Design an enzyme around this catalytic site. Structure first.
Site, PDB file in Angstrom:
ATOM      1  N   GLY A  44       3.184 -35.790 -15.954  1.00  0.00           N
ATOM      2  CA  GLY A  44       3.978 -34.835 -14.393  1.00  0.00           C
ATOM      3  C   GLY A  44       5.813 -35.140 -13.994  1.00  0.00           C
ATOM      4  O   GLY A  44       6.147 -35.812 -15.663  1.00  0.00           O
ATOM      5  N   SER A  45       6.063 -34.876 -13.582  1.00  0.00           N
ATOM      6  CA  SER A  45       7.456 -34.927 -13.574  1.00  0.00           C
ATOM      7  C   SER A  45       7.991 -36.288 -13.056  1.00  0.00           C
ATOM      8  O   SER A  45       8.752 -36.601 -14.095  1.00  0.00           O
ATOM      9  CB  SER A  45       8.405 -33.885 -12.110  1.00  0.00           C
ATOM     10  OG  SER A  45       7.216 -33.176 -11.530  1.00  0.00           O
ATOM     11  N   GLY A  47       6.093 -38.856 -14.314  1.00  0.00           N
ATOM     12  CA  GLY A  47       5.995 -40.461 -15.990  1.00  0.00           C
ATOM     13  C   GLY A  47       4.006 -39.633 -16.330  1.00  0.00           C
ATOM     14  O   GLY A  47       3.422 -38.323 -15.804  1.00  0.00           O
ATOM     15  N   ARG A  48       3.727 -40.357 -16.858  1.00  0.00           N
ATOM     16  CA  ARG A  48       2.005 -40.193 -17.587  1.00  0.00           C
ATOM     17  C   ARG A  48       1.082 -40.714 -16.935  1.00  0.00           C
ATOM     18  O   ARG A  48       1.324 -41.574 -15.656  1.00  0.00           O
ATOM     19  CB  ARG A  48       2.012 -40.862 -19.302  1.00  0.00           C
ATOM     20  CG  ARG A  48       2.362 -42.193 -19.662  1.00  0.00           C
ATOM     21  CD  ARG A  48       2.743 -42.317 -20.360  1.00  0.00           C
ATOM     22  NE  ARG A  48       4.198 -41.647 -21.221  1.00  0.00           N
ATOM     23  CZ  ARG A  48       3.691 -40.538 -22.081  1.00  0.00           C
ATOM     24  NH1 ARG A  48       3.188 -39.929 -22.455  1.00  0.00           N
ATOM     25  NH2 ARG A  48       5.201 -40.109 -22.716  1.00  0.00           N
ATOM     26  N   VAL A  49      -0.017 -39.843 -16.796  1.00  0.00           N
ATOM     27  CA  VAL A  49      -0.889 -40.995 -16.782  1.00  0.00           C
ATOM     28  C   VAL A  49      -2.236 -40.684 -17.688  1.00  0.00           C
ATOM     29  O   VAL A  49      -2.713 -40.520 -18.411  1.00  0.00           O
ATOM     30  CB  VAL A  49      -1.923 -39.274 -15.310  1.00  0.00           C
ATOM     31  CG1 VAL A  49      -3.501 -40.280 -14.841  1.00  0.00           C
ATOM     32  CG2 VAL A  49      -1.307 -39.832 -14.242  1.00  0.00           C
ATOM     33  N   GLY A 117     -14.579 -36.548 -17.605  1.00  0.00           N
ATOM     34  CA  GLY A 117     -15.120 -35.039 -17.912  1.00  0.00           C
ATOM     35  C   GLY A 117     -13.905 -33.943 -17.920  1.00  0.00           C
ATOM     36  O   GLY A 117     -14.540 -33.084 -17.629  1.00  0.00           O
ATOM     37  N   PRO A 161      -7.937 -25.607 -10.043  1.00  0.00           N
ATOM     38  CA  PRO A 161      -8.378 -26.041 -11.186  1.00  0.00           C
ATOM     39  C   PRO A 161      -8.018 -27.204 -12.021  1.00  0.00           C
ATOM     40  O   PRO A 161      -8.818 -28.283 -12.262  1.00  0.00           O
ATOM     41  CB  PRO A 161      -8.786 -25.388 -11.407  1.00  0.00           C
ATOM     42  CG  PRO A 161      -8.657 -23.428 -10.980  1.00  0.00           C
ATOM     43  CD  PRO A 161      -7.193 -23.908 -10.560  1.00  0.00           C
ATOM     44  N   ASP A 176      -4.804 -36.099  -7.420  1.00  0.00           N
ATOM     45  CA  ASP A 176      -3.153 -35.499  -7.108  1.00  0.00           C
ATOM     46  C   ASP A 176      -2.835 -34.714  -5.605  1.00  0.00           C
ATOM     47  O   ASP A 176      -2.465 -33.786  -5.080  1.00  0.00           O
ATOM     48  CB  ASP A 176      -2.496 -34.487  -8.524  1.00  0.00           C
ATOM     49  CG  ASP A 176      -2.151 -34.731  -9.551  1.00  0.00           C
ATOM     50  OD1 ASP A 176      -3.701 -34.823 -10.076  1.00  0.00           O
ATOM     51  OD2 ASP A 176      -1.476 -35.016 -10.011  1.00  0.00           O
ATOM     52  N   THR A 193       1.807 -25.519  -5.581  1.00  0.00           N
ATOM     53  CA  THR A 193       1.679 -24.358  -6.965  1.00  0.00           C
ATOM     54  C   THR A 193       1.557 -22.643  -6.504  1.00  0.00           C
ATOM     55  O   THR A 193       1.361 -22.221  -5.994  1.00  0.00           O
ATOM     56  CB  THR A 193       0.742 -25.126  -8.089  1.00  0.00           C
ATOM     57  OG1 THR A 193       0.304 -26.000  -7.798  1.00  0.00           O
ATOM     58  CG2 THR A 193       0.501 -23.925  -9.290  1.00  0.00           C
TER      59      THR A 193
END
Ligand SMILES: c1nc(N2CCC3(CCCCN3)CC2)c2nc[nH]c2n1
EC number: 2.7.11.11
Lengths: 342, 18
Positions: A44-45, A47-49, A117, A161, A176, A193
């Site tokens: 993301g803007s 950092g990471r997940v 998944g 999605p 999110d 978005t």
């Protein structure tokens, strides 16, 4: 009896649970050194997940890392505080669970349930499109989730999605909450978005929960067609299409699907489904949803149309690969005052 | 076709928020 009175009773109790946590948020429930970092699942803007392993239990989780300095530069302080305050207080079958949160000198951390998944986005793009019953199964889950969130005066504001994970049972887990907000009146922030924005957002008007219902219309269309109802190479061209008051449906769309989508992708707020006197019931009782058993969906009793492949614990094969940057924790506390309540 | 137009567009990848 009346399903609506059971719904009212359920929502009243859910609100009581929500308000206690909303008023007294959980804070500092773990530390970075309790987790072994495995792989980046997304970025993301701020950092990471990352997929992480909780060492004391051996459980896998998804850890969202937000650089405090980057949040500040992007003027996302209040939005970041809303995100964690809301996610720690909610509880619904289709909302990803926040297990722990904490912060250090550099970052904020949100440790959530790992949904293996992958994003619905990945499966949707690869397959091309979902058949109407497949799309309806996912749509029913968002309808219930929104009914829950809106009852708590919450607006989600980022339906797409990319934000919907598929669990091992084939059910959705919404992630999110970066733009989610608890608001009773109208709100004005330009966020979301491009492909999913309601006309009222683009037109800088004060808006409300009806923007999530418009975004549901965009999601259903996208799942069933394989492409969004308003697309272009640049956002400005997308906005011009959204405001025009025109939607074209693929020839394979059923009469019932088109009718539902005309009532969801409705510019007129006094006419948009989800926004009228009957509220969510205008959607739940629509002909496109006649075969949907709302209780069976909430109870997760319905056989899912697609079960993702699962190689085993800690497998990330349903996620794209990403550049890996090692986490740095400064020796000095950054933005302490701004994130005091986190 | 609309599908071909979408596939050839620059917005088939993961979409970021504004
Ligand atoms: C798996 N993956 C997650 N990711 C975070 C959201 C993601 C990355 C950022 C854009 C939206 N999709 C996908 C990976 C999770 N976030 C919470 N639980 C998760 N389980």
């Amino acid at each position: 009896g009346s399903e609506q009175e059971s719904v009212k009773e359920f929502l009243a109790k859910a609100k009581e649970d929500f308000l206690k946590k909303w008023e007294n948020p959980a804070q500092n429930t773990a530390h970075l050194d309790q987790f072994e970092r495995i792989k980046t699942l997304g970025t993301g803007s701020f950092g990471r997940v990352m997929l992480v392993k909780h060492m004391e239990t051996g459980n896998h989780y998804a850890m969202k890392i937000l650089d405090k300095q980057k949040v500040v530069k992007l003027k996302q302080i209040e939005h970041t505080l809303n995100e964690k305050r809301i996610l720690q207080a909610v509880n619904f079958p289709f909302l990803v669970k926040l297990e722990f949160s904490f912060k250090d000198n550099s970052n904020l951390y949100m440790v959530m349930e790992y949904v293996p998944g992958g994003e619905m986005f990945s499966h949707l793009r690869r397959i091309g499109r979902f058949s109407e019953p497949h799309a309806r199964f996912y749509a029913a889950q968002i309808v219930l989730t929104f009914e829950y969130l809106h009852s708590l005066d919450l607006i989600y504001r980022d339906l797409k999605p990319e934000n919907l994970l598929i669990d091992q049972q084939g059910y959705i887990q919404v992630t999110d909450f970066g733009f989610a907000k608890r608001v009773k009146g109208r709100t004005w922030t330009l966020c979301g978005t491009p492909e999913y924005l309601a006309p009222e957002i683009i037109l800088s008007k004060g808006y409300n929960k009806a923007v999530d219902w418009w975004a549901l219309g965009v999601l259903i269309y996208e799942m069933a067609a394989g492409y969004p109802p308003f697309f272009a190479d640049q956002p400005i061209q997308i906005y011009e299409k959204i405001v025009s008051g025109k939607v074209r449906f693929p020839s394979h769309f059923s009469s019932d699907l088109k009718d539902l989508l005309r009532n969801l992708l409705q510019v007129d707020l006094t006419k948009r489904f989800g926004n009228l006197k009957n509220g969510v019931n205008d959607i739940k009782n629509h002909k496109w949803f006649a075969t949907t058993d709302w209780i069976a969906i909430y109870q997760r009793k319905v056989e899912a149309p697609f079960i993702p492949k699962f190689k085993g614990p800690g497998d990330t094969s349903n996620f794209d690969d990403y550049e890996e940057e090692e986490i740095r924790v400064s020796i000095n506390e950054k933005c302490g005052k701004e994130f005091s309540e986190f | 076709t609309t599908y071909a137009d979408f596939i050839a567009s620059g917005r088939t990848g993961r979409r970021n928020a504004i």
